[PDB]
Write a protein that binds this DNA or RNA. Structure first.
Ligand code: MN
Ligand code: MN
Ligand code: MN
Ligand code: MN
Ligand code: MN
Ligand code: MN
Ligand code: MN
Ligand code: MN
Lengths: 136, 135, 135, 136
DNA sequence: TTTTTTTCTGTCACCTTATTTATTAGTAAACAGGAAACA
DNA sequence: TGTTTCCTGTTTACTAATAAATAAGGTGACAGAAAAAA
């Protein structure tokens, strides 16, 4: 099930952004009651993804850092992919969070071929925009 | 919603392919126990997607067909997109059935424009492979 | 082929009505034991009138559709004939299912002209009723 | 049922045509092997319709001759009906023998009314004959 | 010489009984929370 | 803000029961021969 990965994603993003992994701010961001977060963090601490103390914040382990880096790579790739294709901003975030878990790594690899195709050249992007507008 | 769209999609595909949809066919197509299929047909009948006759069969109403056609169109379009981009053959069917239900129809339409950008010209499909090969 | 034409006739009607033909519904329609329905379905499958799938169902082929479409027209025409002529509605169905399989198509074609002769005017049917009401 | 009525019908027709009915005449009339005729004469002896002798012949009783004339009436009426509406002369007989056994007597009476309707006025036949060719 | 009955014996028509599969109806129980509590 | 303790539906199998579809056997009228009676 998909709900297992986003906690690692969020913990990584949070310790890079503000160095403060905590039970509070990862709850409202997911729009869930903090008791579910309390249960999940304690479930996955037992799988070596975390470092924890009864009155201290969380820290990532050696494997958690690189797993989270891959997750952030995937999320950041897909956001700019969808912007290149041209879906309006209001849609992008939840579209990415919807698909990011079900794509296999072969598809994430081959999407890298596609995103570079429209970024290392100026013209192909404008051809794609011309087609996009020709039947809007 | 996703979990009902899967059943509408599969029922439509079976009707289209062979003219009748059976509980024992939907169960394999979805890889579920048939009790779930019957308990879900008796749930789609009250939303008027289906006409359900107990121990006899089921049929799509005019509401159901209009949805099923769009669902199958989305399925084929996403498969063709992944095939144009070059995903491994065995993985395409696993990825498409995963992502398809979370995608807004807005991005489905924009993918429908992306697919024809490359379908328009034989040159582009290997210009892209010129990006691929230098990895 | 009287005994064989009835199955195709009823299967066509039942597909147009329900959307699917089931062995038990055919058995009730022809008023026979369902094993006699199975035994005849497996024969129509080898005469190529229909496609049969074991424990799954039936589909009419291009032969069977065009045959049954004509048989149903014959049925409706004979019902309309006996209803024009003044027979009480109890016995019309039994008479039709009795005679329809023994009439040649020349007879059917001329009965169509007779029915049209009576449906193109109103005075003709009342002269016919006026002769019935004294002979 | 067909094979039960047609022996009375054909025996009556032969008795009125020639004054006597042999077993061979019935076998040829129904196109069957004569032993099938004798084993049916056994079934009719049991039912009072006729008088039988082991090697001499058949004679209809007062019961048989009443029914046989009504069956001959049905035959002649249906033949005249099919001949009025324009069926080809060679097609008539085989169509009559097919339906005479399944039409109930109510339909036969109504068919008699229909035959009267055309036989009492010549113009109706001309109207029907015009429409009969209008679209061939 | 030609019918006209008595047996032989074959397909067949259709139903009864049994069997194999498919469909439906509860029971359960592990999940995913989540309303009150704390600190 | 950092968690704990019972509640509270959801989702899916599983196990039973219920019916539907199919196959293996019988009967038994109806032909069609081929001898036999006349
Ligand atoms: Mn996520
Ligand atoms: Mn993400
Ligand atoms: Mn689907
Ligand atoms: Mn799909
Ligand atoms: Mn019929
Ligand atoms: Mn009919
Ligand atoms: Mn007859
Ligand atoms: Mn006759």
């Amino acid at each position: 099930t998909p709900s297992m990965e986003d906690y690692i994603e969020q913990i990584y993003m949070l310790i890079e952004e503000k160095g403060y992994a905590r039970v509070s701010d990862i709850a409202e961001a997911l729009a869930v009651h903090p008791s579910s977060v309390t249960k999940m963090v304690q479930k996955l601490d037992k799988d070596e993804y975390l470092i924890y103390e009864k009155y201290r914040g969380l820290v990532l382990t050696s494997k958690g850092k690189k797993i989270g880096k891959r997750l952030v790579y995937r999320h950041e790739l897909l956001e700019q992919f969808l912007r290149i294709i041209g879906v309006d901003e209001e849609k992008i975030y939840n579209d990415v969070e919807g698909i990011e878990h079900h794509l296999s790594w072969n598809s994430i690899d081959r999407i890298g071929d596609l995103v570079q195709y429209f970024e290392e050249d100026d013209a192909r992007k404008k051809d794609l925009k011309s087609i996009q507008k020709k039947t809007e």
